[PDB]
Design a protein around this ligand. Structure first.
Ligand SMILES: [Mn+2]
Ligand SMILES: [Mn+2]
Ligand SMILES: [Mn+2]
Ligand SMILES: [Mn+2]
Lengths: 357, 357, 357, 357
């Protein structure tokens, strides 16, 4: 009855404002693939994918363009679609860029389903919209810019900032954290992200020094696939180890939680498998007793976290603000879901033309 | 915007046809509580609860009548409602009859949400309706009636029957299974249910004899809360141990699966927490690699299993056929979801009057 | 030879004095079901059940009234009665309100057995009556009322108080504890109860701050059914984690202790299964090396703790003082068992009439 | 001193002869990406990647074309190159198609290093060339074609064949295996591959029936990422469970072996990380005591297995025979490494032109 009738993708390289420097490299612009899922009901689902590096952008668009043939004329039923894609990519490997593509189709299919029923996604999932506390995510900015960006986020009403660390010396990490604390006061949350840059001994040593400074969480201290190593670092800390942005699918989350790799989780709506994967991830975080935050995709994540039993923090990192209307607002540090069908993503069409690849 | 405006319950004691004798007692009629959830949108959600024994029926209705005050004027948002009920019954114990009541409200709220959007529940959950293979569930019937009921189920197109066993001697168990096999042939599925009647040594001994007869599964061989004991019986068998009808909430399922108590699961839509609990249970069964069947509530279960990644068997045991229209059909041994908004439960109002308590 | 000849129940809503505010809600009056178990020997056993919320009160009374038929004309033999009730509610679920009802019948049957033999319950169990140290249980009272109630309990001879915490900020929790310590001095016991209000990361952080203040124990820091999560919080603490008021039956206690969820236990005489369940719980606490305190039901608990090898503290929280004679006295902070047959509960019959529901 | 000076890729869709039907779909032609790595020494390294489905072919070529910029002008040092690529794709996810691309560059860099030193790859790795027993890999061919292909492989001197199974009924699986056994005699090896098509209960049941037929190994009975489920199936079998073709990198192999998912391993030279990943995988298989076979890429695998301490079987499945010279020969069922520098891959340039995409 409602059928998918086409898939259109556009690759853009959009401006950010502050380039995201991390201890393992910098993301200077955002390579995005914008997705339009057309249906027989005359509504169009919208989603976007983040490619991380320009190197992977045209490959990801091509992959989505070659996948269009297997979903056109299929019923608009995201759970059934995801099972069929998992089976088609059985031999190839349903992970990495293929899983990320399948997740972009899922998020557009759920946006289209919300539009068919004229209801915001959070209400289609069975939950009430509620404000979700958000932290402002900044990068490896050095002492002066990290303190300036934190004072600005506090002025805009945010009650927490995430900074990236992993400087050559531990003293530089601490200098950044101390200067932020001094500027914003003892009540503000300061999350820190090591971006997989330390080995386990180094991560135990640096994390115990940061713990004595009072940070909110320590994110991906070592290689993301090393769940055992994260369990070893967590076992030496009172402060929670945070991870999850790199789990590809709920099945990778299940492995990390099964061995106790972290006390907090922050799945990425794209890498976890879209809305379909997020619902599954949410059920696992509830049983393992893990507070669950989001990673990027703040527009759909404000919806997904209101339906998440252990919802913790929303991450504000506006990757797509240049090409979409600002329907998601932040009031007093909380994200407020727009009262629009589906996810509430509306393209600024003449801005897209400027950034097209 | 859509609000719950009232809750009405009616207690009935309805005729079955074949009384359900089990190795621990007989269920001779069905004590049901019929639930009507009224909304500000002019649609009415419908569900029913099964009380198991007449002894618990008026208590369950009273409990639902006294809970009406906390849900009237709340938004029709089942996930948000369930979180609020879990918190209200925090101290009292969110399990047993209270959890069963909360699950009846959930199943009616999701039926009402399907009606507001004029869509079958399975499509609101994001899946396509598909036929689900079903087995016909019979009871501790002795050799002659168990063989007669199995020949009739095969004539109606079912490809599997469940019989109850746990007779004084193992020889009687085997006599029942052999006589069914002889009547229906080697291709037919014969599930057997011990209904918690054996201790662990006895269950290992009897199950290894039944395994040599070729049964499909062995269900609740010992006390249902003894997950460790079920793991000990399963470790001695090739045939799968089946359980799950008695898990109250996904959190009890999570404990049993975490220690490997069974190779199959069959949650009960009421005891697991309604549609909201079933979605969570489905995500856990997928990660633990457990084929998931249903227990009773065949009308909503045909919908829930089409959205369940490891869906296995639907149980046909028509408890409420006397008071609801036969919109769920079985064609060639498969259940076919009706093309009706919500769950498709329509009361036969003048039959209800005959069975009212 | 002695037979149960009738069961009578009365639902009352009795005044407390200080309403019990907790971090998850308030209990402003006590919904109780008073039970009279009549026997062929002309003695009447007495017990009461606590319903926690008015919402569950008439349901619990109805349940007990409908169960009367299965115990009338049965021998007054509590262990045999409990096995028969466990088997009857096999399919329904022998937990929650059904288990709580079965436990009220058990406690009345043991009171009646003490009366038939004209001996206090503790001596029928094979033990000597001894004074049991008791703590006074208060609630989420804020700094000024929590300090006032603690000074009064010290003036009445108690050497320990329990306060409830879980305020929006950790600073408020600590303010309450510090102000009590200042008022009562460093020798007094200050137990704190979080009433399941924190998630695991939050509970580790707050408990390590309270541990540096010197509290006696930290009670139910997170969701009561999450034994694994309590083991994770306990593993980070020197101070003991306390729990057990919500275990329904010794079999739930056995699961929590098997994974090391707590260093202290406090079973509830009703939820644990009455006197029959308490004897079983006591044997488990002795082998796992767990000091065992009680939760509510101070009249029967003074008897049960004198027969408990690891007896630790009795909880004073007088729920039923309005409708029963004060035969249990507290002298110098210890409860003194009355020298009366059975449990020593004597109804104040004209006060009951005032609170009847 | 030797520098990489360019990277050229060509996408082809080459003929197979027998289409590879599996229980989860068919591979009817082979989508390959041919890679030419040019160096400052005037030698050109050659490798190819297998894309599994036409859907992923142009995406994989594009990805390799966009990666060329990060390796041109880098020293021809495969171990150093792999560490630098792992770090560059840190955030994006060093798995799936990105890992497969990085592995194609690795295999071409090692072919080029063998050419610079004018020595076969196996001798550059420090080992002697030796004949490696090989099995002929066939597909889901039905009874008559599976028996015909097995008689032909025995006539060509192979002593073992792999057939694919996972037919609707277990009886069909057994019919295929029995008919092959009858044709080739009891001394011949018959490997069977389920291609992830069964759930765990079904896989235990079918594998124990095949074990009584005498097969050499049972390959990927269930979902490849479910290591725990493979450990559960292996624990019920005497026959070895085989897996490994889908491990992306030695770190996924390490997780599967750490929990005992299989008694045999067969890494894929592309998915495992090329020659660099294979050397690491070989060291892990030796310590865990796992006989190690190969998956596809028979040209480089004959070299890699002669340097593998637990080398077991080489898989013959000639994907690229149409576009490369037959320098790898099979004599009496064993693969014989050519006496050529590097890997011995020489393009048939005018055949490539026919299959170019
Ligand atoms: Mn991060
Ligand atoms: Mn059953
Ligand atoms: Mn408490
Ligand atoms: Mn294979």
């Amino acid at each position: 009855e409602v059928l998918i009738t086409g898939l259109r993708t556009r690759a853009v390289n959009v401006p950010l404002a502050y380039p995201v420097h991390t201890a393992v490299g910098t993301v200077g612009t955002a390579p995005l693939v914008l997705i339009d899922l057309a249906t027989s009901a005359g509504v169009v689902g919208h989603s976007y994918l983040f490619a991380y590096t320009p190197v992977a952008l045209k490959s990801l668009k091509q992959l989505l363009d070659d996948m269009a043939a297997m979903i056109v004329n299929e019923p608009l039923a995201p759970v059934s679609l995801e099972a069929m894609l998992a089976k088609r990519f059985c031999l190839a490997g349903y992970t990495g860029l293929i899983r990320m593509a399948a997740a972009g189709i899922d998020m557009a299919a759920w946006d289209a389903l919300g539009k068919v029923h004229e209801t915001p996604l959070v209400k289609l999932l069975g939950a009430n919209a509620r404000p979700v506390q958000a932290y402002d995510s900044h990068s490896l900015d050095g002492v002066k810019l990290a303190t300036e960006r934190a004072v600005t986020a506090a002025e805009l009403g945010f009650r927490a900032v995430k900074t990236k660390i992993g400087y050559p010396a531990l003293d530089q990490d601490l200098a950044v954290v101390r200067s932020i604390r001094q500027a914003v006061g003892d009540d503000f949350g300061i999350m820190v992200d090591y971006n997989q840059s330390l080995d386990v001994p180094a991560a135990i040593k640096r994390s115990q020094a940061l713990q004595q400074e009072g940070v909110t969480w320590i994110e991906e201290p070592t290689l993301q696939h090393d769940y055992e190593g994260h369990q070893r670092i967590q076992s030496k800390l009172n402060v929670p180890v945070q991870m999850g942005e790199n789990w590809l699918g709920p099945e990778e989350m299940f492995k990390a939680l099964s061995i106790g790799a972290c006390r907090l989780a922050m799945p990425d709506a794209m890498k976890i498998g879209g809305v379909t994967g997020w619902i599954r991830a949410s059920a696992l975080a509830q049983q393992f007793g893990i507070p669950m935050s989001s990673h990027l995709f703040q527009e759909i994540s404000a919806h997904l976290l209101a339906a998440t039993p252990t919802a913790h923090w929303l991450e504000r990192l506006d990757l797509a603000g240049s090409v979409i209307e600002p329907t998601l607002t932040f009031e007093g540090g909380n994200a407020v879901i727009p009262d629009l069908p589906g996810v509430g993503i509306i393209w600024r069409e003449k801005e897209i033309g400027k950034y097209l690849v």
